[PDB]
Symmetry: C3
Subunit: 253 residues, 3 copies
């Protein structure tokens, strides 16, 4: 329940994993997910953990996401099939993948004390990053671990801007009375994957007041993934020579 | 090949992370999972022409994870290149938000393959919008061994910058004179776009005098580059414009 | 330094890596990062390089990113622990991951001449792409390499469009004198990860002039990750019957 609603990054295959060294080809980051278990009857499939080949304070596993995330928690766990585990570690991270930073200026975070009991560390403040790395500092037996990172869910948007949708000069809004429209079909440069929402706002106004009142409007109608109808309008006795608008359409997920 | 023309081949294009339940050993891993992967047939040490599991039961899987949502059209399954092992039926599971997972067809079996090399495409009953997708073998011949591909619609990526409150100043130069008149306010984006953006630039504050009952006001970008643009406020005819304010939305694609 | 300020993709775990073949499970792309070094006293952790299984002109390593990048440079390096290196190679790439292209129309790019001296190749023109591949053409000893790709920093945005925030008909701005506001609170469909910037622009105007002057405005106040206050206003003697606006809110990184 503590990590309820959060994204399990490794379990969802949301990150690339790079390690400093691997003991051999069956002790790699392929075997790093929290609660990873393998065939206990066969030795050939290796460790229930990522295990390094060099045992020093310079090893690490780094998880990289191309989409920034808010990291709430890192969970550590020992090796499932042997008495090896990381007792403390530091966390480093980068948001822009140019400059790196250290959590708590590099101070240790409390790890685990056995093979299987997970220890969650909720960061003192949530970390905004693309890439994050566990750097083992002290260990029992060997530098061997399983892990997970828990992030807020991400949302993804795609936006298209289109400029200068125009009624034309001396348009139909410039004669008659009551509610009047000039409809201009608009087609997006590319079709959205899901239905967009559309903002559509004025950039050029050429209109005549009526008993001192300005009455002008622009609104999308019949929004699809492919485009929409830009509806310019006026009402009452107003005469409107022209209206121009820019649009911003955004689809989510 | 024709049936998936124009679709993105995820594994071929290295567009997903692959995680497996188990790997037989270090030369039977997801590194060997791509459709039509072939290796050195004269040397045994490079392993299988397939991902092969370690535990042989109904709880195995390969998960493909994408950080950017995709419309999955099809999954292609193929047997192992170098030995008589293949998956004969499987289920598909997926997640869009990476919090809740769902089973395609409520977990009903999907038809797999019947030999080493003949690909069997499954186009999903309805295309699936997802970030992560998993193949869960249900029945097999010999061992749990496969090569696979996922086909998605091409994705488009945009990057957007909003800037607020580009302003003429009070009692600006548009508030005197006749004919077409402009006040130009250079705008620099917070960061340089990778490619040329398109720019929406629209009013949020208007302070103007009509001219024989006509309002005449405009704002338009000029000289748009990846670094910024010129915000041109204007009026025309005999109109006097005290001030105009605008916000901008600039978006670059791909 | 020639690559200062650029993102090191492999170092930052920003790409998936697929290879044509791997010599065995300790000669894989897990060992491919520039300057990768392993345990030199133990043979079991394999090569300081990705090494192919098949030695021909058809091998490759592909780096894939879901987020388009601007590729500035590819760095090649030999194998750290043996006299094997790639002397020339070609580059191929794809932006849409459907159509692929060859750099220099397939012509050779100069590789390396020893184990450890890095040779940077800055592309004739930067390449905009999602996926990129090194294809060895000639080699010493075996097809064995370490590498890096250097890209411009990327920025990520998330955008929400909200339509039709409205004062109501015959709103409070339609009476009185002096600066007057009507405040409409707005909650975004979802909470942004970081503080957004907000564009808020007119789509319907219904107002009276005052001694021929139009005076109208709309502005966000108290923007948070969760929403903002939409402030519609007028001033002086103007009477405004109604105003309507659409918003566009974007958060970076
Ligand atoms: C139905 C109609 O035209 N209603 C208008 C209203 O929009 C507003 O302009 C008001 C100003 O006092 O005048 C009304 O006549
Ligand atoms: C060149 C010029 O000023 N053209 C204006 C036109 O924009 C519009 O306002 C029209 C209204 O009847 O009047 C014209 O004088
Ligand atoms: C404090 C105030 O109302 N200032 C207004 C100014 O905004 C502008 O409209 C100008 C038009 O000449 O008139 C001034 O009275
Ligand atoms: Ca415009
Ligand atoms: Ca504004
Ligand atoms: Ca609207
Ligand atoms: Ni990966």
């Amino acid at each position: 329940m503590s990590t309820q609603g959060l994204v399990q990054l490794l379990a969802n295959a949301q990150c690339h994993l790079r390690t400093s060294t691997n003991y051999n080809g069956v002790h790699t980051q392929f075997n790093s997910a929290l609660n990873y278990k393998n065939n206990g009857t066969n030795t050939i499939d290796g460790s229930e953990a990522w295990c390094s080949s060099i045992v020093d304070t310079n090893q690490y596993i780094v998880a990289g996401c191309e989409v920034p995330r808010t990291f709430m928690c890192v969970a550590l766990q020992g090796r499932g099939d042997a008495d090896q585990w990381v007792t403390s570690y530091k966390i480093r991270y980068s948001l822009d993948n140019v400059s790196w930073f250290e959590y708590r200026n590099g101070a240790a975070v409390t790890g685990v004390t056995d093979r299987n009991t997970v220890v969650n560390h909720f960061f003192d403040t949530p970390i905004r990053a693309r890439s994050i790395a566990i750097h083992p500092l002290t260990w029992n037996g060997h530098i061997s671990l399983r892990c997970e990172f828990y992030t807020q869910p991400v949302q993804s948007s795609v936006t298209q801007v289109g400029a200068d949708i125009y009624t034309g000069d001396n348009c139909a809004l410039n004669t008659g009375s009551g509610k009047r429209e000039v409809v201009v079909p608009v087609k997006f440069q590319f079709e959205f994957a899901t239905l967009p929402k559309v903002a559509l706002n004025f950039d050029q106004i050429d209109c005549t007041d009526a008993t001192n009142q300005t009455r002008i409007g622009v609104q999308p109608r019949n929004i699809t993934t492919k485009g929409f109808d830009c509806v310019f309008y006026t009402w009452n006795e107003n005469k409107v020579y022209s209206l121009r608008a820019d649009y911003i359409a955004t689809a989510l997920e």
